[PDB]
Amino acid sequence: DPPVSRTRSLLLDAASGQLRLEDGFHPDAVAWANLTNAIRETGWAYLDLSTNGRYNDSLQAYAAGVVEASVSEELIYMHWMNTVVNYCGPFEYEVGYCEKLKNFLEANLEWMQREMELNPDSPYWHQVRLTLLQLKGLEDSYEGRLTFPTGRFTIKPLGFLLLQISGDLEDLEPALNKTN
Amino acid sequence: CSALIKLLPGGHDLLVAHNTWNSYQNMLRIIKKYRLQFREGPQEEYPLVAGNNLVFSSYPGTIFSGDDFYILGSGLVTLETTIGNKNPALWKYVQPQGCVLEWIRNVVANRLALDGATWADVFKRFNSGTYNNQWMIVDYKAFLPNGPSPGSRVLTILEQIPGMVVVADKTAELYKTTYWASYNIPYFETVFNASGLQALVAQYGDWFSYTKNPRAKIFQRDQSLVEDMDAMVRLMRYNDFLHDPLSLCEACNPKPNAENAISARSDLNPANGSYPFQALHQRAHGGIDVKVTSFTLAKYMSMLAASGPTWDQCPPFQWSKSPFHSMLHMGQPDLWMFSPIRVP
Numbered sequence A: 001d002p003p004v005s006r007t008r009s010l011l012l013d014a015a016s017g018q019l020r021l022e023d024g025f026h027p028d029a030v031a032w033a034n035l036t037n038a039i040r041e042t043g044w045a046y047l048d049l050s051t052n053g054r055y056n057d058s059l060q061a062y063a064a065g066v067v068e069a070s071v072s073e074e075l076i077y078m079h080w081m082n083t084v085v086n087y088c089g090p091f092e093y094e095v096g097y098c099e100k101l102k103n104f105l106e107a108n109l110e111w112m113q114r115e116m117e118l119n120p121d122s123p124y125w126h127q128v129r130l131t132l133l134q135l136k137g138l139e140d141s142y143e144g145r146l147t148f149p150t151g152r153f154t155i156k157p158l159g160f161l162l163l164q165i166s167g168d169l170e171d172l173e174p175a176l177n178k179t180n
Numbered sequence B: 001c002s003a004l005i006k007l008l009p010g011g012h013d014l015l016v017a018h019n020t021w022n023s024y025q026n027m028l029r030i031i032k033k034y035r036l037q038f039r040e041g042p043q044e045e046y047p048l049v050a051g052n053n054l055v056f057s058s059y060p061g062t063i064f065s066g067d068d069f070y071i072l073g074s075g076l077v078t079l080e081t082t083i084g085n086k087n088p089a090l091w092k093y094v095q096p097q098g099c100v101l102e103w104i105r106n107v108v109a110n111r112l113a114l115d116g117a118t119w120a121d122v123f124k125r126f127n128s129g130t131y132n133n134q135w136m137i138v139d140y141k142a143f144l145p146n147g148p149s150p151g152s153r154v155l156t157i158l159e160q161i162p163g164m165v166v167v168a169d170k171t172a173e174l175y176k177t178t179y180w181a182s183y184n185i186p187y188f189e190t191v192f193n194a195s196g197l198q199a200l201v202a203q204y205g206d207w208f209s210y211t212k213n214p215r216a217k218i219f220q221r222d223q224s225l226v227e228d229m230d231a232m233v234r235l236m237r238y239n240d241f242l243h244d245p246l247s248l249c250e251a252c253n254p255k256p257n258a259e260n261a262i263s264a265r266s267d268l269n270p271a272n273g274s275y276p277f278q279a280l281h282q283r284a285h286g287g288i289d290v291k292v293t294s295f296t297l298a299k300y301m302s303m304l305a306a307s308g309p310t311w312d313q314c315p316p317f318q319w320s321k322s323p324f325h326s327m328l329h330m331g332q333p334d335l336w337m338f339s340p341i342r343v344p
């Protein structure tokens, strides 16, 4: 049940030095996000989100995911419920497919983590890492627990990754011999 | 999804529009503006990426478009329609190692690219063979209002299937024909052939044809009527399947099919209808938006966006007044009668 407007910032505490969400606009923060929900009136919500370039881009990516999650929690929950809640759930028939998909996604995620470690100087893998940090921060935030990874991190194959891979799954499904 | 890239008469403007086809249950929508400060590489000496600013049509918890439609501060507009793959012999190219999933490849290309060539170059690396799309990359930096064809750089077409990515600059073709339409069918004959579409043309006919499918045909017939932003909205919203001969499905009973339009309304197909293949059935699926931009609008990181199934010439979709009232659609309006809005 989203409010018209919600603004959250993620500050890195000078002392802690821990990340904490605050309400409102704080341009000193690592990131801030503003969700305006006009779905009832226009069929759209609007998000704008900024990260602070005075922090490195890893922390920015993570924080970007965190702040998006914090201003859109209800929308995330509902979208998840509408779209992917049951996908490979606890009670799936297609356990053959779902196990293959979990294996695939875990191996894929591990392969990228490995490539990032093996290629700390790579622009490409750097951009991949930022993308996954953003994903990680989004999931962490929604879960209510902020852990900024400085090295390798684990993405849940069937967590918020599921919201990103809907188009990928259209082909993963047949490639992993799901019936149809 | 449908897309149209329209060169206005006299090259007055270049309009770029995309209409997502999706399950209606996906209709919690967020238009997202990201203002990031990422660098190209893991060191502070690295330049800021070309694509730090981006507006895109999206969904809750979805850290990319999914549609896709993006306006990037690098002057690029990236959009796709999905081609998929019907050749099972290509699936061996879908591997957990050596394949970066499409959504990440998309985000990364969007971030690093300053032009269509580099977008294609970045995106095609570690081709996963998943979310197999035709991507259109419009570089508005290469667009001169009123100017003649610059020969290159305005339009880059990329088509991905497993094990194969084909890329061409299609500026000349855009300027010559005055449009680029996209409608879920690969344009590159090598991609069309490699992904098993010939067999489906052979079995089902024109629907799988690049040039003869209903949308190709409607675009061929009607694209020139897009003379401005609202005309673009209108063609992108287009569904008049009951009365449009181009919406006739000859193997179907009844013959008018709501799938056979620019903006599908599969919900309006009869449940007891007889249909040669699943796309044509009654479904809680169809066009669920239009997003449109222009040279000036892209420049200001801005778009016209309309949310919901088309209601220009079809009754407005309304969950409670639909075969799909029991489907989960939390947070979603019941009645979908929304007009385009400037965003923002």
Ligand SMILES: *[C@@H]1O[C@H](CO)[C@@H](O[C@@H]2O[C@H](CO)[C@@H](O)[C@H](O)[C@H]2NC(C)=O)[C@H](O)[C@H]1NC(C)=O
Pocket: A012, A017, A018, A019, A056, A058, A059, A148, A149, A150
């Ligand atoms: C970017 O910034 C963060 C924050 O300053 C760095 O993370 C700190 O790293 C030290 C040593 O790695 C840790 O002990 C601190 O606990 C980290 N702080 C936080 C907030 O977690 C980080 O190393 C920098 N670089 C990268 C690549 O992330």
Ligand SMILES: *[C@@H]1O[C@H](CO)[C@@H](O)[C@H](O)[C@H]1NC(C)=O
Pocket: A100, A175, A176, A177
């Ligand atoms: C799926 O089945 C095919 C045979 O149709 C087989 O060759 C292939 O190894 C299988 N792929 C996976 C990943 O299960």
Ligand SMILES: *[C@@H]1O[C@H](CO)[C@@H](O)[C@H](O)[C@H]1NC(C)=O
Pocket: B189, B190, B193, B198
């Ligand atoms: C594609 O397939 C068609 C039908 O078999 C054939 O006529 C054509 O030569 C092929 N084209 C290419 C470029 O592969």
Ligand code: NA
Pocket: A167, B001, B066, B067, B068, B080, B081, B082
């Ligand atoms: Na798509």
